[PDB]
Symmetry: C5
Subunit: 31 residues, 5 copies
C-alpha cells in the first residue's frame, strides 16, 4: 500500500506536467 502511494504521488504531479505540455503545444498553434 505504501509503495503504491509513492508511485501515485509521482503520477499526481505528472498529470499536471502532461496536461500543461498538451496545452502548450496547442497554444503554439496561435496563428
Amino acid at each position: 500500500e505504501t509503495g503504491t502511494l509513492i508511485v501515485n504521488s509521482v503520477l499526481l504531479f505528472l498529470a499536471f506536467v502532461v496536461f500543461l505540455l498538451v496545452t502548450l503545444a496547442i497554444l503554439t498553434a496561435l496563428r
Copy 2:
C-alpha cells in the same frame, strides 16, 4: 505479478500521453 501489474498500469496511460504528443507535433505542421 502484482509488481508488474503496477508497472503496466503506468504504461497504460503513458501510451495515451506519447500518442497524443506525436499527434500534437504533427498537428503543429498545420501549414
Copy 3:
C-alpha cells in the same frame, strides 16, 4: 526512508527538466 530519498533525488532534477520544457515552448511563441 532511503528508497524515498532516491525517488526524490530523481524528481529534483526533473523539476528543472519540466520547468525548462515549459519555458522553451513559451519561448517558441516569440513572434
Copy 4:
C-alpha cells in the same frame, strides 16, 4: 535478473518514443 529485464522492457519502447520525438521536432523544421 528479472528486475533488470522489466526495466529494460520499458526502455525498449522508450527508445522508439524518444527517437520519434527528435524526428518530429526536426520535421517541424519543414521550411
Copy 5:
C-alpha cells in the same frame, strides 16, 4: 548499491535525451 547503479544507468542516457530536447526546441527558433 546495485539498485542505485541501475537507476543511475537510466539517468545516464536520459541526460542526453533531455539535453537533445532542449537543443531541438531552441533549434526551432531558427528564424
